[PDB]
Symmetry: C2
Subunit: 87 residues, 2 copies
């Protein structure tokens, strides 16, 4: 992954092809409420890591926060442009 | 996926590259006991579907049983050849 968009394109492909190995597929089938919960959990993990853990551990939790944010975007039908226009 | 081996090669790639979206990664990190449990659950789902559900529903559950069988093989370090030599 070179850009935020590389992952986003990948997850869109996973939603199309629905491979057995894709976490995104089950998450997208599973509804928005569970996605919001997961995102909040990960924000807590990020805070813990930011305060108390290594750079690597923090990078790991941030990567998961970014992942779940993208899954939520796809669940609600948002594009990268929808978000990027506000930055 | 054209052959059992296509999926197996894919899951091996996922174990190498460890993408955020891969169910296999978390499962491989998570230990054999949880994998055995998942496999048994899926065998039960397959039986239910075989007795009571559509061909499509049965194909779905079988595909998941095959997936978890492959994840277990990778967890324990088995090759396709290790299994295929016994068929």
């Amino acid at each position: 992954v070179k850009t935020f968009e590389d992952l986003f394109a990948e997850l869109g492909d996973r939603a199309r092809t629905r491979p057995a190995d894709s976490t995104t597929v089950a998450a997208l089938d599973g509804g928005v409420h569970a996605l919001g919960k997961k995102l909040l959990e990960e924000a807590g993990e990020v805070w813990l890591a930011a305060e108390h853990e290594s750079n690597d551990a923090l990078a790991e939790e941030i990567s998961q926060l970014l992942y779940w944010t993208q899954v939520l975007m796809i669940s609600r039908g948002l594009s990268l442009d929808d978000v990027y226009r506000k930055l």
